[PDB]
Amino acid sequence: SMKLQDLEVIVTAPPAPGWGGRYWILVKLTTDTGIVGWGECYAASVGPQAMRAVIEDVFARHMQGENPENIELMYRRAYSSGFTQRPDLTVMGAFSGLEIACWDILGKDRDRPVYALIGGRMNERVRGYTYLYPLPHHDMTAFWTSPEMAAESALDCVARGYTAIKFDPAGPYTMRGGHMPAMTDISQSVAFCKAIRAAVGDKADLLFGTHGQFTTAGAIRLGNAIAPYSPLWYEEPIPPDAVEQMAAVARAVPIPVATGERLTTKAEFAPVLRSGAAAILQPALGRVGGIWEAKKIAAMAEVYNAQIAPHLYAGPVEWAANIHLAASIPNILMCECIETPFHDQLIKSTIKVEDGFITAPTAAGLGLEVDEALARAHPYTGNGLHLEMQEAPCDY
Amino acid sequence: SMKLQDLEVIVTAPPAPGWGGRYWILVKLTTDTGIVGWGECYAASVGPQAMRAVIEDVFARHMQGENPENIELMYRRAYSSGFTQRPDLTVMGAFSGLEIACWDILGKDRDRPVYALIGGRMNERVRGYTYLYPLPHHDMTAFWTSPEMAAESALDCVARGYTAIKFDPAGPYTMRGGHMPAMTDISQSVAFCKAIRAAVGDKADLLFGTHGQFTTAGAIRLGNAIAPYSPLWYEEPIPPDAVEQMAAVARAVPIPVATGERLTTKAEFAPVLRSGAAAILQPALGRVGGIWEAKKIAAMAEVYNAQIAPHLYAGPVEWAANIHLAASIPNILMCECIETPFHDQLIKSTIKVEDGFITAPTAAGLGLEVDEALARAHPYTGNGLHLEMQEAPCDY
Amino acid sequence: SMKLQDLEVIVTAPPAPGWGGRYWILVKLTTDTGIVGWGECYAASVGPQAMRAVIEDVFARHMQGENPENIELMYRRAYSSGFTQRPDLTVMGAFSGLEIACWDILGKDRDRPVYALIGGRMNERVRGYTYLYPLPHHDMTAFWTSPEMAAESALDCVARGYTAIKFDPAGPYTMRGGHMPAMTDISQSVAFCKAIRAAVGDKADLLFGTHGQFTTAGAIRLGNAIAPYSPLWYEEPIPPDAVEQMAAVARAVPIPVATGERLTTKAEFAPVLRSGAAAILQPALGRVGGIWEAKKIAAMAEVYNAQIAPHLYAGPVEWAANIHLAASIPNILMCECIETPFHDQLIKSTIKVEDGFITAPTAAGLGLEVDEALARAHPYTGNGLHLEMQEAPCDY
Amino acid sequence: SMKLQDLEVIVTAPPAPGWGGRYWILVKLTTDTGIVGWGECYAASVGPQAMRAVIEDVFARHMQGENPENIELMYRRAYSSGFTQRPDLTVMGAFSGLEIACWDILGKDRDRPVYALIGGRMNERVRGYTYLYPLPHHDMTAFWTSPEMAAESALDCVARGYTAIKFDPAGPYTMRGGHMPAMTDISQSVAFCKAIRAAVGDKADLLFGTHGQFTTAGAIRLGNAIAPYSPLWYEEPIPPDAVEQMAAVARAVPIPVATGERLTTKAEFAPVLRSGAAAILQPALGRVGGIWEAKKIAAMAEVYNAQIAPHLYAGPVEWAANIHLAASIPNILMCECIETPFHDQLIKSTIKVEDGFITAPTAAGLGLEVDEALARAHPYTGNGLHLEMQEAPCDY
Amino acid sequence: SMKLQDLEVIVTAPPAPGWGGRYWILVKLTTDTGIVGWGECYAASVGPQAMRAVIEDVFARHMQGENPENIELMYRRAYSSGFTQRPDLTVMGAFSGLEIACWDILGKDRDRPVYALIGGRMNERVRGYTYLYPLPHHDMTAFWTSPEMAAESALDCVARGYTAIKFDPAGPYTMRGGHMPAMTDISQSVAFCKAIRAAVGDKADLLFGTHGQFTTAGAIRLGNAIAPYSPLWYEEPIPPDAVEQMAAVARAVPIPVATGERLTTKAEFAPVLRSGAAAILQPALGRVGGIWEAKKIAAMAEVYNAQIAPHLYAGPVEWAANIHLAASIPNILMCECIETPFHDQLIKSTIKVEDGFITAPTAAGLGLEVDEALARAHPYTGNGLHLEMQEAPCDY
């Protein structure tokens, strides 16, 4: 009948230049019958050590002993934990990773690809995209304020088959809340869009990968400045804590709005759709509630004629979860990709970006072979968080 | 992979008094590997023979030769058939039954119950309800306008474990569209409620089960008249073709509004939730687009703090799908039930109501032993449609 | 007094190149007094043979034996059939054709043109428009992605007296639901507009004739990309299954939105006008519920200061119905025309486009002389639907 | 085609006690081919003498020498007269009566009843209702403030077969605008409903026939007070010049609101429906724009799940146009009736109320035989308008 | 300036019967200058052990080595931790308790009560209230379903000077989400209100203390049922994850809605007020973001003419922060109180309820003298969370 039994947490630090963050939180579950599943947690409101305790509390309290088929039940338990029953970002981070592991386990038990268990091969291939990263000759410090070098990266990404590319020239996000962009921030953003569009012409779409730096006013001003270059989407124009405000940006600029990487559960995505705050949803599966929760959200997007674009600023296990969701949904737009040697070998190259696209895996579960020894051979030893928000204010 | 190859359509007609309708449309699917699934189409816009052609077409065009795992894909094909991509009540009725059979097949192939493949056993048991049917010693003509006899039935249902009962005392629905209830329609309604509430007290809920006879004005007048007897739902107050009007009713009466049986696809249920037209959804699985589609709707009701009460005015195969949906969703209210000797024997009693509740089936697929020879022995020889809207006007 | 007695269904297949689709579903009704009427059905959710049974069911069940004068009555039965009373796309497709045939009958009985029966000659002549089709010297396959050949074709349309021309360069529509355009899809749309606008100058309006390929975001991006060339309308920017979304496109682009060819009944058109989803309504009379239902819709659009543009992707019979509707309403915009030899011959040339306009017919009924012989000598033997949604995704 | 040629206006004055008003304005049209049609104008802003000049002007400018078939065209002309194109109550009151005569003419030319021309026999019998008028033995002046005597009248109406009766005990309407009812106005209204509901029980519906006397606040207070007696409708709760405000009453009281007897054209009825100001429309056909205009309005009501209750405070001719409209619309609710010997005599007893209902007429046109001699023998010699608004304030 | 230096977490467990929960999480902060401040964390998503790691992380990352005066800055840091900047229930539960200790420290440094620091003594006495707990002679298990015994408790509370009492007879809250109440749930709720209102008369207000058990529909049914007994408020009618939905209850029932004990930060309270979801806010200070955050929220409530009713289901330390908030805000309504010997002892009887009220404290800071030894002598040895959500479904 099958029962979840063992939990291991492995925090692994990607090697410099560390595209993808300071550390990835990996979970490995084992059933009483020995079926092993991998998952990944997306949480950094507190550090990895605190998260370990959180993940183990979630697992023991709501999941250990349970039949892995009972995803609804386990979600309801974690979501309701401690008389809450409302989005707990940290707890959901914990549960999402464990839940993804459950799916990897279910695919192995059923001997099918995960997407085959959740609606079938809707898509043979999935369109991918990547951030513009420094080229092996780019001054890695200048590269981040250089329209010219970004355009070079864009050109290289296109040659590799990518049909869309993301970037954020808009300046620093801070702990202070939204701020008005400096004029130089606006000019910079225009120069980037101008340079990158001129480079790739029609061959690719531009994704403005803003990080919620701005007040509604600021976002609108910046939104209209980059409008002329025909960006596919305008990501997180304002901080994730004001739904009606983001819908206000959406109405005021011609660019489609994208958001979701910092949201969790359908409870939070529902109002985003209902108000018109975004036309493109970007869950981080390691945060949002897992694959199933994300299937629910994707069905919601359908009735708003909206598309999903799964977030990735983490490791290849989370990414695999994204691919499997992407594969099973009619309204997929594209999957975010982070192509590094370390991403590739953590899973022994089992899933791969091929000329811009990702093919639906054939292997069982997530289709991964996780290199646990490599994972353990790279411990995190910093005291920072996976991601961090600047202390200093915008520079005028 | 398994491919769907064969299709058999079987129209069977319930022996009198025919609780459940004039005929049930069963589809029996078989894959190339010899696995058999049963589905049930809920479609009566035209007769069984036209529907047979519709079902045959839909199957050959969009499903035959396809991996049964690909439910998303097949739904998209059917939904879009012929450059439509909007709800087609007749095609979707055909697809719904085929899609159901697909899940029976997948359940057998995985050797698991259907609910285990769609989120797991969220519910060990499911609350049931029945309509108030005449007792053996009841004049089967007088019964339907009799508060006194309806109360005897109410009592009999309570003694049998049922914790909820439905009735409709409000007069006939006609081809004409909504009308104003005769004042005697309101009086008879209030008298039913008075009698049934008196008899059961707290042991059961009252489900006022209208058939959309009324104009908005009329529906609101009726609703306010039966509100004192505290019904749990007010079902289809008006016709299924004006969401905003139903919401109007919902805002003007204290009773929760239930609707669904005449709706199809999530594209029609979305505006129902969005506009406040109904707090309780009642999809007919043989009509909405199948089990998967209904899972998406249940997920949608979920962010409206709303619940699902699967419709049943058909045979035991559709009921079975209702119950596998029910067992899998946290936001289930109750399942419509119809206990007749024919229902029971058509599935060799494999699924049964017990003391008002239904236990999550255990066997593979839908968990049924369909008695094909018995269904074929009961051909439909009538001229009528499964249901009919009378021609005569409301009698004043 | 006279009654509807006999029905013949005749499916006819136009010769290549096939402007008008794969087949037209013609209905011929005969009264017991021997008067003959013709009509056309617009339905392709299932194939010709299935429709035959549906049409035959609809007629036998609700129309046969009935006084043709009773349009309201027969509509209520079909609309309500089998306890539905919400739009059934397949049943209404069938009914519309029978309904149009009834009008032809009525016109022949009254010895007056149909328009004279439904409000009189409001318009002496009716403004027409056409798709841009390949000129004889055009590469058939290259033409469809060539701004240059389109402008050549558009110039020929102006020469023949057309004052508006339609085209769709935006790419393929798929069963997957709305997608985001490739930048090439946008570029190409712009080049088509630039080219076609430069050729015709003020001499003709451009109608951007899109097909619901896109997501709301994608539709908005495309929309104000083509705005600089001043299209008279922006057709079906998104799929027909999300009203509120289409209104969202309408608020965001400066172009007037037209829609309706995949809609049926006033019940579906009412929320389109009410929501501001479209300023221009394009019923297909063979689908929408017939000439009468279409008059009701046209009067509805009147109180929204909106107009009607009858859709044609079918035969001269549906077209005849369109023109009689057109001649009878104040708020007529224009009438889609498909000028092929076979369109002409099937009605022995009884109605003609002349220098871009059609003159109100004088002959009784629809004013046609249908060439049954011709129709029967062109049967449809194909396996496809009149129209079809492609399975492959948009190419990126 | 035949052309409208001659106009004859005939103002006739019902004998005492004169239920139906001070005078009816009849029009008699003759075609060049000698066909005679009768209609009725409903206009009293200015007196009989000024209205003659209005009617003669409208006829000569817009309708004389036109084919009577061209109803849309003639409406467009009158509606637009003198660069207006917005509802002109006075002009439309003239055109409505002329329009009705056109339908009478058309029915005779076609040799069918008018309803057979406008959608056919949707209804075989029309449900009727009547004001509570004094019984012979009643003090004709005490009666209007006597719940007891009103109850005797209602009870007599039920014996004659009526299933709904109307009354207004709410006090006088003044030229001042809406006022707050005196507490005595409210208590008397209550005492009327109580006595009439007690007398009729379920045998008849109560139609509260207010005359827009009250401010919104006052309307709401009155409505709530009478709610307990369950009136089918609450007529003109406030003046007809603030729709948003009437919607406010409708939302604040449980009683279905009815209005329309003082509105004209679909341009004024659209906002009523659209805002939820009324659930029941009551056009006066001699004012609203004619039979065709009433048809468009009825179609509009359909998509709001609302009904039509044709107004009558005039002669038998406008009543006939009411009956033919009612016969042709699915959403009829009931027709107001005024039973006096003079009504009967003016049309030679040709259409009658029988046991509460009216059977669809059979003779051609309106099916009337108007007694011109009797009309010309009853000249209006008074100065008063058909109806008037009190000068004196409400009495507190 | 002084800097926060040391943190000490102390989990303490109230003795039986343990009103106030399973354990309280206290924090003790010391400055480099040796000043000691106490606070209380309100978090139970995860257990005491995980929360320690959370609290220690938050303190070390964001507050250690900071001037305690910088409350805005420390909040901004914690709120934003790890690129979040949206409400994190778990992290905020940690920071809230730390924040309270900061205020205790500040009050001591300034040598004034905390309220004197945050707007001053707006109120000299705070109005209090309490749950109905069992009286000694009560069967401690029969009591919770005994209207009779609850009435005895309420009556005892009135003798002690309370002017408002809270109770919840509505049934259990489950991890499943909202459910429909059983009729017995509704009848018992009614019997509770009746017996308690009868006993207290006008001497006290009834606070219906529901726990978000119900679906919207169910919430509305329950509310209407209890309305007659005139409760001052209706607490958490539904789960805290659908504001639009809670506003819907508020509009549908006459009882003022209260909520907030499960929300955090002004970012979640703003939409509540803005949508009319609640008229009375009840923040748990140990969860919402601290005393300062509660102050901003109270100011927000002011412009909505809404009040604040500080939540307490924890120890005396959070209660103290409640009292100081209450003392400083114009729109206080009442403070929840839990009177156990252990509450008293933990703070050495230093703040007390007297005759239903609490007098503004006088000693510096929180005005408490926390008994660390008593706290450290009552370790939590259980595994359960402070509160939990039932697994079992509602019993019908």
Number of other residues whose CB lies within 10 A of the CB of residue C300:
26
CA separation for the pair A291, A103 (Å, rounded): 8
Q: Which subunits have 3 or more CB–CB pairs within 8 Å of chain A? A: B, C, E
CA separation for the pair C86, E368 (Å, rounded): 68
Contact assignment for A127 to C238 by CB distance below 8 Å: no
Q: What's CA D215's distance to the chain center, in Å?
A: 23
Which helix (H) or strand (E) is A36 found in, with range?
Answer: strand A36-41
- List chain B residues with CB under 8 Å of C61: 46-47, 385
3-state secondary structure at position B305: coil
The token pair at E277 is 């979801």
What is the phi/psi pair of residue E387, to 5°?
-135, 160
CA separation for the pair D367, C319 (Å, rounded): 36
Give alpha helix (H) positions in D276-354.
Answer: 285-288, 291-302, 316-328, 341-346
B122, B256, B304 member nearest E220 (Cβ): B256
What one-letter code names the amino acid at A255? I
Number of other residues whose CB lies within 10 A of the CB of residue B105:
26
| Cβ-contact A41, A10 below 8 angstroms | no
Contact assignment for C44 to B81 by CB distance below 8 Å: yes
CA-based Rg of chain D, rounded to a whole angstrom? 20
Give alpha helix (H) positions in chain B.
Answer: 48-62, 71-80, 89-109, 147-159, 183-200, 216-226, 243-252, 266-274, 285-288, 291-302, 316-328, 341-346, 372-377
The token pair at D157 is 């109406």
- List chain B residues with CB under 8 Å of E184: 202
Breaks (C-N over 2.5 A) in chain D follow: none
Please report how the helices A48-58 and A89-110 are oriented relative to each other, as an axis angle in degrees rounded to 10.
Answer: 60
Which helix (H) or strand (E) is A129 found in, with range?
Answer: strand A125-131
Number of other residues whose CB lies within 10 A of the CB of residue D45:
12
CA separation for the pair B75, B58 (Å, rounded): 11
CA-based Rg of chain A, rounded to a whole angstrom? 20
- List chain D residues with CB under 8 Å of C272: none
Contact assignment for D230 to B221 by CB distance below 8 Å: yes
Give one DSSP letter per residue of B43-98, joined into a string.
--SS-HHHHHHHHHHHHHHHTTTS-TT-HHHHHHHHHHTTT--S--HHHHHHHHHH
What one-letter code names the amino acid at E31? T
φ/ψ region of E347 (left if φ > 0, alpha if ψ in -120 to 50, else beta) reads alpha
Residue that is written with structure tokens 């519906």 in the block: D205
Contact assignment for A67 to B303 by CB distance below 8 Å: no
C266, C267, C302 member nearest D266 (Cβ): C302
Contact assignment for C70 to D121 by CB distance below 8 Å: yes
Per the DSSP assignment, residues forming a β-bridge with C31 are C4
C54, C265, C387 member nearest B82 (Cβ): C387
3-state secondary structure at position A18: coil
Query: For C48, which residue in chain B has the nearest alpha carbon?
Result: B57
| Cβ-contact A245, A274 below 8 angstroms | no
Q: What is the dihedral of CA D226, D229, D233, D236, to 10 degrees?
A: -20
| Cβ-contact B86, B276 below 8 angstroms | no
Beta strands in C266-388, from DSSP E residues, in sequence order: 280-281, 307-308, 335-336, 353-354, 357-359
CA separation for the pair B321, B104 (Å, rounded): 9
| Cβ-contact E165, E132 below 8 angstroms | yes
The token pair at E161 is 């000077």
CA separation for the pair A350, A344 (Å, rounded): 8
CA separation for the pair C335, C115 (Å, rounded): 15
Per the DSSP assignment, residues forming a β-bridge with C353 are C358
Q: What's CA E60's distance to the chain center, in Å?
A: 26
Q: Which of C186, C187, C255, C396 is the mutation pick for testing A, counting most A CBs within 10 A? A: C396
Q: What is the pairing mode between strands E24-31 and E36-41? A: antiparallel
CA separation for the pair D145, D132 (Å, rounded): 12
E44, E58, E76 member nearest A175 (Cβ): E76
CA separation for the pair D23, D40 (Å, rounded): 11
Per-state percent for chain A, helix, strand, coil, to nearest 5: 40, 15, 45
Q: Is it the case that chain C and chain E have 3 or more CB pairs lying under 8 Å apart?
A: no
Contact assignment for B241 to C91 by CB distance below 8 Å: no
| Cβ-contact B119, C272 below 8 angstroms | no
Domain ranges, ordered by start, for chain D = 1-111+366-396, 112-365
CA separation for the pair C172, C168 (Å, rounded): 9
Which helix (H) or strand (E) is B131 found in, with range?
Answer: strand B125-131
Residue (of E1, E127, E38, E61) closest to E366 by Cα position: E38
What distance in Å separates residue A345's CA from the closest CA in chain C?
29
How far CA D82 is from CA of A151, C316, D85, D287, in Å, comes to 65, 40, 8, 19
Residues contacting E263, CB < 8 A, separation 6+: A86, E87, E240, E269, E272, E283, E287, E288
Contact assignment for D303 to C266 by CB distance below 8 Å: yes
Please report how the helices C48-62 and C71-80 are oriented relative to each other, as an axis angle in degrees rounded to 10.
Answer: 120
Per the DSSP assignment, residues forming a β-bridge with C165 are C130, C206
A123, A256, A302 member nearest C221 (Cβ): A256
What one-letter code names the amino acid at B297? I
CA separation for the pair A308, B36 (Å, rounded): 35
B71, B302, B328 member nearest A266 (Cβ): B302
The token pair at A392 is 């200093």
Contact assignment for E221 to B280 by CB distance below 8 Å: no
The token pair at B177 is 């569209």
What one-letter code names the amino acid at B109? D
What distance in Å separates residue C339's CA from the closest CA in chain A?
35
Residue that is written with structure tokens 């570029």 in the block: C187
Contact assignment for B91 to C86 by CB distance below 8 Å: no
| Cβ-contact A62, A38 below 8 angstroms | no
What is the phi/psi pair of residue C159, to 5°?
-65, -35
CA separation for the pair E312, E309 (Å, rounded): 10
Q: Which of B63, B84, B246 is the mutation pick for testing C, counting most C CBs within 10 A? A: B84
Resolution in angstroms comes to 2.5
How far CA B156 is from CA of B160, B356, D116, D152, in Å, comes to 6, 12, 53, 46
Give alpha helix (H) positions in chain A.
Answer: 48-58, 71-80, 89-110, 114-117, 147-159, 183-200, 216-226, 243-252, 266-275, 285-288, 291-302, 316-328, 341-346, 372-376
Residue that is written with structure tokens 């639906």 in the block: A360
Q: Which of B74, B79, B281, B296 is the mutation pick for testing A, counting most A CBs within 10 A? A: B296
Contact assignment for E85 to A387 by CB distance below 8 Å: no
Contact assignment for A89 to E91 by CB distance below 8 Å: yes
| Cβ-contact E71, E2 below 8 angstroms | no
CA separation for the pair D102, D97 (Å, rounded): 9
For residue D254, whether the previous peptide bond is cis, meaning omega lies within 30 degrees of 0, is no
Per the DSSP assignment, residues forming a β-bridge with B93 are none
Contact assignment for A83 to E211 by CB distance below 8 Å: yes
Q: What is the pairing mode between strands B205-209 and A280-281? A: unpaired
Report the 3 state secondary structure along chain E.
CCCEEEEEEEEECCCCCCCCCCCEEEEEEEECCCCEEEEEECCCCCCHHHHHHHHHHHHHHHHCCCCCCCHHHHHHHHHHCCCCCCCCHHHHHHHHHHHHHHHHHHHHHHCCEHHHHCCCCCCCEEEEEEECCCCCCCCCCCHHHCHHHHHHHHHHHHHCCCCEEEECCCCCCECCCCECCCHHHHHHHHHHHHHHHHHHHHHCEEEECCCCCECHHHHHHHHHHHHHHCCCEEECCCCCCCHHHHHHHHHHCCCCEEECCCCCCHHHHHHHHHHCCCCEECCCHHHHCCHHHHHHHHHHHHCCCCEECCCCCCCHHHHHHHHHHHHHCCCECCEECCCCHHHHHHCCCCCCCECCEEECCCCCECCCCCCHHHHHCCCCCCCCCCCCCECCCCCC
CA separation for the pair E315, E27 (Å, rounded): 12
| Cβ-contact D26, D37 below 8 angstroms | no
Q: What is the pairing mode between strands D257-259 and D280-281? A: parallel
Buried b (16+ CB within 10 A) or exposed e, D144-154: bebbebbbbbb
CA separation for the pair A85, E178 (Å, rounded): 10
Number of other residues whose CB lies within 10 A of the CB of residue B380:
18
CA separation for the pair A367, A381 (Å, rounded): 30
CA separation for the pair C336, C122 (Å, rounded): 19
Chains A, B: CB contacts under 8 A, how many? 73
Q: Which subunits have 3 or more CB–CB pairs within 8 Å of chain D? A: B, C
Give one DSSP letter per residue of D171-198, joined into a string.
---BTT--BPPPHHHHHHHHHHHHHHHH
Residue (of C307, D127, A210) closest to B180 by Cα position: D127
Residue (of D323, D244, D249, D236) closest to D280 by Cα position: D236
Residues contacting D316, CB < 8 A, separation 6+: D343, D344, D346, D347, D351, D368
Contact assignment for E217 to B233 by CB distance below 8 Å: yes
Number of other residues whose CB lies within 10 A of the CB of residue E391:
12
Give one DSSP letter per residue of B164-222, joined into a string.
EEEE--S---BTT--BPPPHHHHHHHHHHHHHHHHHHTTSSEEEEE--S-B-HHHHHHH
The token pair at A109 is 């038990």
Residue (of C102, C108, C92) closest to C4 by Cα position: C102
Per the DSSP assignment, residues forming a β-bridge with B127 are B357
Residue (of B14, B62, B5, B4) closest to B317 by Cα position: B14
Q: Which subunits have 3 or more CB–CB pairs within 8 Å of chain B? A: A, C, D, E
Looking at domain D112-365, its CATH class is alpha beta
CA separation for the pair E101, E285 (Å, rounded): 12
Contact assignment for E396 to B163 by CB distance below 8 Å: yes
Architecture, CATH, for domain A1-111+366-396:
2-Layer Sandwich (3.30)
What one-letter code names the amino acid at D21? G
What is the phi/psi pair of residue D56, to 5°?
-60, -35
| Cβ-contact A38, A101 below 8 angstroms | yes
Q: What is the pairing mode between strands E4-12 and E24-31? A: antiparallel
CA separation for the pair C285, C321 (Å, rounded): 7
Q: What's CA A2's distance to the chain center, in Å?
A: 31
What one-letter code names the amino acid at D321? A
φ/ψ region of B385 (left if φ > 0, alpha if ψ in -120 to 50, else beta) reads beta
Report DSSP state, residue A214: B
Report DSSP state, residue A63: I
Contact assignment for C292 to D119 by CB distance below 8 Å: yes
Residue (of C139, C213, C207) closest to C176 by Cα position: C213
> Which residue pairs, CB below 8 angstroms and at least 24 apart, start in A375-379?
A375/A10, A375/A12, A375/A26, A375/A346, A376/A10, A376/A12, A378/A12, A378/A13, A378/A14, A378/A15, A378/A342, A379/A11, A379/A12, A379/A13
Q: What's CA A252's distance to the chain center, in Å?
A: 26
Q: What is the dihedral of CA E134, E138, E141, E144, to 10 degrees?
A: -50
What distance in Å separates residue A10's CA from the closest CA in chain C?
38
CA separation for the pair A80, A68 (Å, rounded): 19
3-state secondary structure at position B25: strand
Edge-first strand order for the sheet with B24-31 is B4-12, B24-31, B36-41
Per the DSSP assignment, residues forming a β-bridge with C41 are C25
Give one DSSP letter per residue of C58-103, joined into a string.
HHHHHTTTS-TT-HHHHHHHHHHTTT--S--HHHHHHHHHHHHHHH
Query: For A74, which residue in chain E has the nearest alpha carbon?
Result: E175
Half-sphere exposure of E342 (CA within 13 A, CB side): 20
Residue that is written with structure tokens 């674009």 in the block: A309
| Cβ-contact D42, D314 below 8 angstroms | yes
CA separation for the pair C278, C307 (Å, rounded): 10
C177, C184, C221 member nearest A330 (Cβ): C177
